[PDB]
Amino acid sequence: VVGGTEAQRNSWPSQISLQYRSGSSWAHTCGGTLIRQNWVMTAAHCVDRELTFRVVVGEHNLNQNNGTEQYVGVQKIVVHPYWNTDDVAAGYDIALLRLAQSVTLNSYVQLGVLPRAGTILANNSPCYITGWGLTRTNGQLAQTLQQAYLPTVDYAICSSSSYWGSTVKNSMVCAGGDGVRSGCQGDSGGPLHCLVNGQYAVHGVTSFVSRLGCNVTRKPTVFTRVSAYISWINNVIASN
């Protein structure tokens, strides 16, 4: 997250850290959202490579023991059938991970609230992006969970020539673009928390930013619109 601030520890309890094994150590690569005690929602491009993955819930500081963490392996990876790694702009950047074991829900680990199917947010709706991603374009990961206020930019505006153009589809959500705050590598797969009817619900899965950089004016961070995949998500978890 570029231009963010440290989140209160465990204040976004559904946020998870997706890590892969490199040699004898682990490395954070993406964010994700705990949607069931044994299911995590993340981006399809996060699990494109064939690596050994593990999920960490209740995490805050990636380099030290917070005394609230739970580590669990990934038993099954279900990528959306239409995902095309060579065309992130085509959408479908979403994947569900079945954990090897059910995590224990508590003060630091809770399920993320998903929007009702088809829900579209009005322009400039209040949302927050969270993650351990780069804090600057081509910079380095954050040690502690970061958050940044990132209001939405509706489809009409986001798909206009002044912004992303035809690169963005109606199956995506745009947020930010103020040139100061944005998501960045490492935030991918993470949530976009938006305030709806008094509660924060996960409306987006961090998907991509401009090749020019993370925080670029009029180039909002783009997210997979969760509400477009509710039926798919329910069908996977009910038959797996």
Q: Which residues are annotated as a binding site for Ca(2+)?
A: 59, 61, 64, 69
Show contacts with Ca ion in window 47-66 (CB under 5 A). 61, 66
Range 187-217 burial, b when 16+ CB lie within 10 A, else e? bbbbbbbbebeeebbbbbbbbbbbeeebbbe
Check: CB of residue 40 under 8 Å from CB of residue 33.
yes
Q: How many residues bind Ca ion (CB under 5 A)?
A: 2
For residue 154, list its beta bridge partners: none
Q: What minimum distance in Å lies between the beta carbon of 21 and Ca ion?
A: 17
**Closest residue to Ca ion using C-beta atoms:** 66
Joined together, the tokens standing for residue 159 give 């798909």
* Nearer Cβ to Ca ion (69/178): 69
Amino acid letter, 197: N
* Nearer Cβ to Ca ion (135/221): 135
Q: What minimum distance in Å lies between the beta carbon of 28 and Ca ion?
A: 11
* Nearer Cβ to Ca ion (125/144): 144
Q: Is 70 an interacting residue with respect to Ca ion (CB under 5 A)?
A: no
H or E stretch covering 72:
strand 70-79
Check: CB of residue 189 under 8 Å from CB of residue 43.
yes
Look at residues 121, 96, 110, 129 and name the one whose alpha carbon lies nearest to residue 206. 129
* Residues designated as active site: 45, 93, 188
Q: What minimum distance in Å lies between the beta carbon of 12 and Ca ion?
A: 14
* Nearer Cβ to Ca ion (68/160): 68
Show contacts with Ca ion in window 91-150 (CB under 5 A). none
Q: What minimum distance in Å lies between the beta carbon of 58 and Ca ion?
A: 8
For residue 173, list its beta bridge partners: 223
- In the complex, which residues of this chain contact Ca ion (CB under 5 A)? 61, 66
